[PDB]
Design a protein around this ligand. Structure first.
Ligand SMILES: CCCc1nc(C)c2c(C#N)nc3ccc(OC)nc3n12
Ligand SMILES: [Mg+2]
Ligand SMILES: [Zn+2]
Length: 313
């Protein structure tokens, strides 16, 4: 356990920042994830052999899709790292362990299609899981990999603690269902502004961790413009593919997913920042003040999309 990971000086330094890009070198991401766990949790949190073999099974079970891929998993785990390191007294030992694993696992075996498409296709996963279809599958796959021989990174926990960490991971991953985000933030907004928000109330912590999960999962919109711009291409390649598949069921897809309507994207991103991203990072900053850079960076990109619409870029 005297074996720490060290990154090159630039990554060692930039990794602490919310807007850190994990780069185009796939083979460095596992070491980036381990480095983050060792700093955020401790070198003793996870047996290195088991963690390494858990990370590569998770990697194996992410698909070669444009966006909902292994790079998204590590990118969302990093944002969670950045939140935990900037608020380090606010979270228990079990939450620091569970939430970085929850972020790595949150989109396991994603095919690049929405819960809606599964439903209209009548996918078997939609029969098994009536709401949060993909997100219940993702948790299912997380438990599957935890129960592979030699992959139980939580072996040293007690019966109680183990059940608590798997319950943290479950709620964490279910919250990545953006349909539940809108009601969760509203409740949080009320609780905060009436002064009834209480982080000793387990049902309140759940809600806050829920918002943190939405904030990490949307964190591509908190990157420097050139990263956010190029990530949007990957996100939209999935949306257009799903639109194609909708048209193949004989359903006209919403404009967002229609590749014939690419000209409507800059307005559609405006809608998304205002209705989803800005509110998310606003309420997050109100609750967790040190997370303010995510809101600042998100606003900067909103401003850059406004520029696109005016044909300034
Ligand atoms: C599950 C995709 C959620 C998501 N994550 C990001 C980082 C973006 C994004 C950007 N840039 N633009 C989006 C536009 C619409 C939309 O509808 C759900 N999701 C978006 N989105
Ligand atoms: Mg998801
Ligand atoms: Zn995701």
């Amino acid at each position: 356990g005297l074996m720490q990971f060290t990154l090159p000086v630039r990554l060692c330094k930039e990794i602490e920042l919310f807007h850190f890009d994990i780069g185009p070198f796939e083979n460095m991401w596992p070491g980036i994830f381990v480095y983050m766990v060792h700093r955020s949790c401790g070198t003793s949190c996870f047996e290195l052999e088991k963690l390494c073999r858990f990370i590569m099974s998770v990697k194996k079970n992410y698909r070669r899709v444009p966006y909902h891929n292994w790079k998204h998993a590590v990118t969302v785990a990093h944002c969670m790292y950045a939140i935990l390191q900037n608020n380090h007294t606010l979270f228990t030992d079990l939450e620091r362990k569970g939430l970085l694993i929850a972020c790595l696992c949150h989109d396991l075996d994603h095919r690049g299609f929405s819960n809606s498409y599964l439903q209209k296709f009548d996918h078997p996963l939609a029969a098994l899981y009536s709401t949060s279809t993909m997100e219940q599958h993702h948790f299912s796959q997380t438990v599957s990999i935890l129960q592979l021989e030699g992959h139980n990174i939580f072996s040293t926990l007690s019966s109680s603690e183990y059940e608590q960490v798997l319950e943290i991971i479950r709620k964490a991953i279910i919250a990545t269902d953006l349909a539940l985000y809108f009601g969760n933030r509203k409740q949080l907004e009320e609780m905060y502004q009436t002064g009834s928000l209480n982080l000793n109330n387990q049902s309140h912590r759940d809600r806050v961790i829920g918002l943190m999960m939405t904030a990490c999962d949307l964190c591509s919109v908190t990157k420097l413009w050139p990263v956010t711009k190029l990530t949007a291409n990957d996100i939209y390649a999935e949306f257009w593919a799903e639109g194609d598949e909708m048209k193949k069921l004989g359903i006209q897809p919403i404009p967002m997913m229609d590749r014939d309507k690419k000209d409507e994207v800059p307005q559609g991103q405006l809608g998304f920042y205002n209705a989803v991203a800005i509110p998310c990072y606003t309420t997050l900053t109100q609750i967790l003040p040190p997370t303010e850079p995510l809101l600042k960076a998100c606003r900067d990109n909103l401003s850059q999309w406004e520029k696109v619409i005016r044909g300034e870029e």
